Amino acid sequence: VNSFSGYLKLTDNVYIKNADIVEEAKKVKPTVVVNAANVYLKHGGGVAGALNKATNNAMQVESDDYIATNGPLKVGGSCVLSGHNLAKHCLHVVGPNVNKGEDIQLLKSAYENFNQHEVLLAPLLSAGIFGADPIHSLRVCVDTVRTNVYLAVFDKNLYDKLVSSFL
Numbered sequence: 001v002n003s004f005s006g007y008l009k010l011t012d013n014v015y016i017k018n019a020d021i022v023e024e025a026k027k028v029k030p031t032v033v034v035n036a037a038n039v040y041l042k043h044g045g046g047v048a049g050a051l052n053k054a055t056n057n058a059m060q061v062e063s064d065d066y067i068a069t070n071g072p073l074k075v076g077g078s079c080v081l082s083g084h085n086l087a088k089h090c091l092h093v094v095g096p097n098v099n100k101g102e103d104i105q106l107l108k109s110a111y112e113n114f115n116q117h118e119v120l121l122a123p124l125l126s127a128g129i130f131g132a133d134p135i136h137s138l139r140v141c142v143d144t145v146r147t148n149v150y151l152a153v154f155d156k157n158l159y160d161k162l163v164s165s166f167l
């Protein structure tokens with residue numbers, strides 16, 4: 001039993017809700033919140049810009065030190081950093097950004113990072129400003145993640161479409 005509330009159960013391990021991931025994290029304080037990161041951990045817009053703003057830019061400060069030490073992530077890769085005031089940890093995961101020409105096949109590799117964590121609060125990778133089809137992202141999530149994932153979909157219209165079209 002965990003403290004997530006109001007989610008629709010899609011499969012044995014995937015749950016979905018129309019919610020602002022920032023407000024959800026603040027309420028639940030999950031062990032792991034997933035950020036929709038880029039390889040430079042430059043948290044400018046979308047989910048990443050929103051999470052970082054909620055940390056008063058502390059996420060960006062920590063991220064800049066991470067990059068200065070380690071260099072950029074790989075597309076499809078991840079790193080674990082602090083969750084600041086939002087969660088214990090933040091798993092920064094880089095899905096392919098179609099608006100950059102990146103291979104959508106890397107979306108499965110991106111979701112594989114979730115399997116290293118027993119429970120996560122997450123967005124749909126590569127959706128929104130990353131330019132992929134969210135219906136496809138949800139399908140890859142369900143077919144790749146085996147740990148317990150609580151998906152927050154900001155757009156209510158999109159949430160309704162994601163639910164109605166789920167196979």
Ligand SMILES: O=C(O)[C@H]1C[C@H](O)CN1c1ncnc2[nH]ccc12
Pocket residue numbers: 019020021022036046047050123124126127128129130152153154155156158
């Ligand atoms: O449009 C949406 O609903 C999704 C898809 C996109 O990739 C990011 N976005 C979000 N999802 C959940 N919480 C969020 N807080 C701020 C933005 C946001």
